[PDB]
Each structure stands twice: as C-alpha cells, then as structure tokens.
Design a protein around this nucleic acid. Sequence first.
RNA 1: AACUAAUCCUAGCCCUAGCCCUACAAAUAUAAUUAUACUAUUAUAUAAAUCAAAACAUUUAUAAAAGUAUUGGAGA
Lengths: 92, 96, 198, 204, 176, 32, 125
Amino acid sequence: FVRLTLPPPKVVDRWNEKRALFGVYDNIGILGNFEKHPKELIKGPVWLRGWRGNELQRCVRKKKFVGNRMFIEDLHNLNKRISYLYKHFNRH
Amino acid sequence: GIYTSDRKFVQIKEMVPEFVVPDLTGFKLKPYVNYRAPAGIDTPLTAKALFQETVAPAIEKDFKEGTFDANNLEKYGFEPTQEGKLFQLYPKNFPR
Amino acid sequence: YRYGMSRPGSIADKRKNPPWSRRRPVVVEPISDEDWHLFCGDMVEILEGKDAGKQGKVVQVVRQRNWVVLEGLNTHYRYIGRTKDHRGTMIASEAPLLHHQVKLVDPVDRKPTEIQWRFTEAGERVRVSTRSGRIIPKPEFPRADGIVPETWTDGPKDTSVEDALERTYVPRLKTLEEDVMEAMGIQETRRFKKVYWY
Amino acid sequence: HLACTAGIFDPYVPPEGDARMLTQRTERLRKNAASQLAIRKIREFDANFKTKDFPEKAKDIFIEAHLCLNNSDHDRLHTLVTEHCFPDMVWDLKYKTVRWGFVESLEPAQVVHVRCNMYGQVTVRLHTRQTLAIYDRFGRLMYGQEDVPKDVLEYVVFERHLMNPYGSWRMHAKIVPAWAPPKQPILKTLMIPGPQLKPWEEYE
Amino acid sequence: GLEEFFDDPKNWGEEKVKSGASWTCQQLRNKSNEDLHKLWYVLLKERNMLLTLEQEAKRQRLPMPSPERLEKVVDSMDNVDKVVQEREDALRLLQTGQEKPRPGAWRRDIFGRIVWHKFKQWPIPWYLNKRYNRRRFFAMPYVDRFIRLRIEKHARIEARKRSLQKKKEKILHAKF
Amino acid sequence: YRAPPPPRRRPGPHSPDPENLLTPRWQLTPRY
Amino acid sequence: ARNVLYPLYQLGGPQLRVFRTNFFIQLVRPGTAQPEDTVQFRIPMEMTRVDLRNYLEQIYNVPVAAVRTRVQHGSNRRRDHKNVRIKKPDYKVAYVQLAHGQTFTFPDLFPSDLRCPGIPSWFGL
RNA sequence: AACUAAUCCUAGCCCUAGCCCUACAAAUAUAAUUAUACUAUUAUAUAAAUCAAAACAUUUAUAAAAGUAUUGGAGA
C-alpha cells in the first residue's frame, strides 16, 4: 500500500562549496608540469587507489595489501569466499 | 558451631556473636536532625588529615627539640604489628 | 522514553511512556550546564507562544526537554474533575515553553537581552548581558516542600538544634571499635591462631 | 493558576420594582460607604475605574461574548469571560446551532455594587431585549423564537485579577433577581418516570 | 522494648509524622567514635520501627504515614557507616599502607583475564591445601585465540557504537 | 567561495628515522 | 550482621562480638492463629534463632521463652512482560514465645433546569 | 462513510575511511559461583577431506619482467 502522508519538502543547493569546488585541480598533471599525476588525487581503499580490477582481483589485492592487518575471522572468511570465486571464474 | 562425630551439633560459644548494645541514656543524638540545622559539607577523613591532626604536632615539637629517632617512631603512634589488638587493621579480623 | 510535563515515574508518566511504547524518540538539542541560563524564579520574556512578549517568572524547568514553565503565562483552560456525575471544572493550566522561546530580562531595563555567563568577585556564576553589560542576580525561590528551616519545630525523634551542632570527635590514635572498648572497658586476652591468607 | 474565584464576595440584594426605576444612582451615592472603599481598591491598581463609565465597557464584553456563541468562537469567548463562566455558557450547547441577536437595550447599564490575593467583582445591572432560537443536530428548532424579542433584566458580575499586571475585566457570573419572570419553556414535552420498586415491593 | 517497635500512640491515625532532616556526613564526623556507635543503634531502632509499621501496613493494604522517615534514617545510617569506615581506612593505611582491609592480589583465570583475587584465611597453608591447589589460576594455551577475539570484539563494539550514534544523528539533521 | 591552495609535493631530501619500526627496511638500505 | 565476612575461629581464639548490627527485623501480626505470648517476626534469612534470642534480650531487653522459625519459599511463578520469571524474596518467619509470664497483643495500628434541559443555566434569555 | 484491514519513520544495519591494543557487599573451578583442610594440578602432530580434473589414482591457486618459461594422469 501507498503513503497517506506527504514527505518533508526538500531543497538542494547546487552552488554549495562541495559542488562548486568539485573537479578543481583535475588537470593537476597537465597544468602542474606533471609533477603530480591525477591518479595521486584518488581517495579510497588503499588497495584500489589508481587501480581497477574485477571482483576477484580486487579481493586478492585487498588480501595482499592488508593481510598482515586483517582479522583472523575476516581472513578466514576471505579465503573461503576466494575459493568459491576462484572455482567459478576459472572453471565455469 | 561445629558438627563433631556421630552427626552431633556442638555449639561453639566463641563463634556465637555477642551483640554489644550501646547505652542510649543521656545520648542526645536521635534518628532525625533539625531542618533548622544546616547541612554539613562532606569532608572525608584521610590518612594525611589524621596524621596532621595527631601525629604532626608531636613530631614537630620533637624534631625542633631534636629528640627524634627511628626507635621512637612507635611513640608517635606507629604499630610495628597488628597482633595483640582485638581489632586488627590489616588483615581485617574483626566484624562490624 | 519521551519526557513530558508530568513528572517522571508518575502515574501520568506511565501512561505517556508505557513499557511497550516504541514511538519515534523526540530529538532535543543538548544544552550544556554552563550553556543553560534559565532557573526557577527567573524573570524572562516569552519570545514566541500564546503569551509572547509577556514577562514571567519561571516555576518549573524540565531540562531534558529544554522546557521552561511560567506561572500564569501560556496558560490554557482545561477541565479538572471530569466525572460521570459532573462535567468538570475549568482551570488554567500552564504549557511548556522551550528554552529558545524565552530570554532573560535585565532588571533596570526590561528587554530580552542576550546574556553571557561570567563569574563575580564572590565567585558565584552570574549571567551578564551581552549588550549593556549588567549582573542579573540569582532569584530567590521558595522551598518546594514549603518547610522554612527556621520555622521548623523539632518533632519526636528529632534532635534539638544545639545537639546536632555539638562536636565531640577528638583526633586520637584509636579506631572506633577501640574507642568503644575504652568507654565500655571491653578487654580480650584470647588470640586467634595463625591463618594463612590465600 | 487561578484568575477567578467561584462565587461572589458579598451578594447584592436587588429591590423589587427596580425595573420601573438619577434615583437609583443616588442610592449608590448613599451606599458608597459600603462600596467606595472597594471602589478605591480597584482604583488603586487602575485609577481609571469609575462606576459611571464601567457599564459601557462591561456591556460590550457581555454582548460580544453572546455573539461568540453563534459562531462558537470559544477562543474569543474564553478571553471575554472567566474560567468559571465559560463552561456553563457552552457545555449544554454541544452539537447545537443557536441564532442570537441583541435588540436595543431597554435601560442603560449601571454599576450596582462592587467587592474585593485580590479579586474584584463588579455587579452590573442590564435590561435588554434579545432574540434566541436553538435547533437540533438535524436542524429542528427546539427552543426559542427566530425573530421574537424577549425583554430580560439581569445583574451581571464581572471580575478582574487586580494583582496580576495583565489582569483584565472578564465576565464571571450573573445575579438573577427573584422578581424576574421565569424563562420561556422548552417546545418539546417531557415525561417524568414513576417510582422504581423491586419485585417484592408494591406500588406506594 | 515492645513499644519501641511501634509508633507513638498519639501519632497513630495521623496522616503523617513530623520529622526533620537526616544526619549529614560532616555532622557525624564531628561526633565522637563512641557517639557514632551509639547513634547507629538509635537509627537502627527507628528503622526497625518504621519497617515494622510498614510491614503491618502491607498486611492491612494501607499506606505508610510519612514514608520519608525511613529514607531519612537509612540515609543517616549510610552516612554513619562511611564516616566510621573513613576513620578505620585512614589508620590502616598509616600503620600498614594497605589500601584494602582484606589481603588480595592480581591473578590470571583459566580464560586469560586478569582479575583481583581476594585472599581467604585458612587454617592450613596453600601448599598443604590440595583443594586450593586444585583451584585453577592458570590460562590454557587455547586462550590465545580468545584473546584475539576479545581485542576484535572490543573493536567491534566501537564500530557498532558509531553505527548507533549515526542513526541518532540522522534524526538530529532531520529534526534540525 | 575561494578554492583551496593547490596540493604540492614536498621537495628536498627526506631522511627516514632508522629506529622507527614502521619505516620499511628497503627505505633504510644503502641503495636508498 | 548480614552480607559481611565473619572472623574464622581457632582454638583459643577471641569470642565473637558484633559491635554494629546490620540485622533488621519487623514485627508482624500473625497470619495464623497463635498464642498471645507467641510473636511472629520477619528476619533476614542469614540470622539464626539463637541470634534472635540474643538480639531481643540485648537490644530490646525482651525476655524470650521459646522460639520456632520457618523458611517461606518465595513464589517464582510470576513473570514479567517479557515472560521472565520473577522470584519473591525469601523471608524467615520466627515464632517467639515470651518468658516471665509476659503476654503480647498486636497494637491496633491504623485504627440546567430539569424542566428545560439542554439550555445552559447561564442563559437568562 | 465499514467491517475485517490499511496507513507511517526510526528500531537499527552495511561497506570503506580513520584507528591497533595496553576498558557494591558476598560467592566461586570443590558439585564453579557452597565463608576454613577432603582429591593434587595439565591443551596440542603436515590440517584433512569435500572439492577440480565433468569418474578416479600423481596432481588441484588460497610494480614491471609475466601469465613469458618450465613443471604437470603435458590435464584440471
């Protein structure tokens, strides 16, 4: 069934600092004499900063990067998940 | 008490508590206090306060006079051992 | 648990907050103890409400809901004693006012002047107006129980004033148990045998 | 918080034949010994309270309060009358529609008697012709006539909280003189049930 | 006396019994050691009478007049105990330096946790007490896995706590 | 709004602290 | 004294003295029919009958002839809104017979107009 | 316009980022939670298999050079 009440009114500012300053320095490499590569500006998980791969590759790279810092429970779960993923992609 | 052989109970007088009841005749303190009486700000007693109130004056006078030595530490109130007292501070061997 | 005008734990409070209630909690902006400036007996001006612009004296403060109650202001009319036999009697009941809905009043000039907390020479915290800086003294509020300490008369089992004020403690190198022994002359020559604590 | 007190401090006794009746005003001049000290107390907080001019202010509240009944302006009527007065006026009017109008006052309103932490009650004498017609939930007429003026003389008591800075004059109660005629009867006919008895008992 | 177990006959039938404020800790400290012991019984006697009256009220399904009296007595009794304890504690520290009246030490349980073990007095020494030796104060090798779980659980608790705060924060933004 | 200062790489020699455990071994080798 | 540690006794050891008593007792009207001298008391479960004898004789100076005590099991059938059993605290009932021929009796504590309905009486119109 | 029902938003969660960690009394391993003696007091071998090789047997993962070479029922 459907709502019988109106949702709260929402107004979004498209000129906020985050949106206004979005994309600045995206040309750092070409405009910065190539001292800093644009890949250096990527913020995210360490094992996938400036790198891309399939789900299996991402998990494997994650294991290598933080394997020494991973929990035993997480490490055991990752190994079990990897085994299932390995069989599916490499045999089916 | 203690249960001896033959499954016979033997009450021990020493282990049976004796209720020490204070004498309330002439005692002016009662269960309640006046609302007229101002409330008392809590100042818990501490070892430093107890030492300062009682022990410090004795040592202060003695130290100036020069009659201070290790052997007379008990004179100012030190107890080398708690044995011999009915109530032993540590280990606690007495009930409330 | 939603705080209401009814005192917590009261029969009315139980109806307001039954054990099985899981209603959406009401969010009230936290106010620090230093930040809070409204106290019972404080003359304040209602910024908004039914009696907005009418200055009143605080009589109850539910800090959990940031509610200030002014006697004889923001007062609605309700029926007390409603029963089968009788319809009920109309009475004037005050409604809660949020903290932002009132402001403190400068004594000399009656206005809703913003205030800042600052200490005095005595050290007691006093609210000081941001503009036309002045000390708003803490108001005097009657005791809720209605018992005036001076007027109180000792009843049975109540110590007299002098008895309570008497000090009999004498610092000495003896515990209370030892002190009681000296007064009552308890002497014990028996000694416990060695016990290995462990 | 109570802004009104039920009852009247001292009940003024209306004299028979006052409707026929300067004159009565002088009787107040004679009786200000009993009331002037009270009038001074109202004057102390106000200083503009005069028995001569109060009825005009009092009359407006009385007429205005009656108008609110037709529109059911409970909030407006709340301010006009005291907490005690309000429930009586509207409680029995629930789920009913009333058309009330005020015909020209037969005689001018005059203050009659006043009394007074401090609550001041002022008795006002009002004779006015009015029209009343009340209908059922279905709209059927149950009481009064749509356009028939009824001449009624009553004494109306207003009250104010002298101590409160915001205290104002609000209608508190009405004194009904015994010599006033009875109110019009209801259109419908009622039935009085007989005595109730147990099976063992017999009629008595 | 039997009469002491019950309220004043004059007070019987009264809505309440007039009583003053409870003893404060500082006033009790001012009182002497002997006075404190005397006062404790006085408070206890009143407490028993109030308790005696209250239980009869429960049987009669009636309210207790002036229930605050019992609270005042209990508050006074609680203040008395700590004041006496303070004096005893201070002297014990002075003469012996022990912060606890009962001997104790930190010991490791079979689960690998470190807990304060309160020593017990025995007529025999520990080495001659097989049952005391039978008690286990050593952690098994498998507890290492549990120790890692405990650290992970502590981190998990913090992570869950942040999620709980986040849900509360959502309404704060929505409400304000 | 005014844009933040552009990010800049730190220039000049940087000497890792040998005692620190975290510092990688290869950064402490003579080849480094 | 309850919820406290009592000193262990050895041969030749001191007599046990309780300077401060934590035991609290309540006099209760007998639920059953008992002799007048007999008195019912609710006492902590850790108190012994001998303790009551000394307690009454010393603190209250009451002479006691005989004592009979029972332990009342607290019903755990009661459950909360969550269906969790609630256990009533167990209490001990002591039947104490007075000595010297004394007798006890429980004190007597806690000794519009009908013709015109629907028109508010306020209206004078 | 009626019944049975339906209606709702926070109860909370998920992943990265960041960050290692060093968070009452009384009773208790005896029969755990029994205030004092008994009776001495004590975990763990490659991880395997399943699974893949369409069965099954050696065998079967758990920065660039580079999926190059070798190895392998030269097959997964």
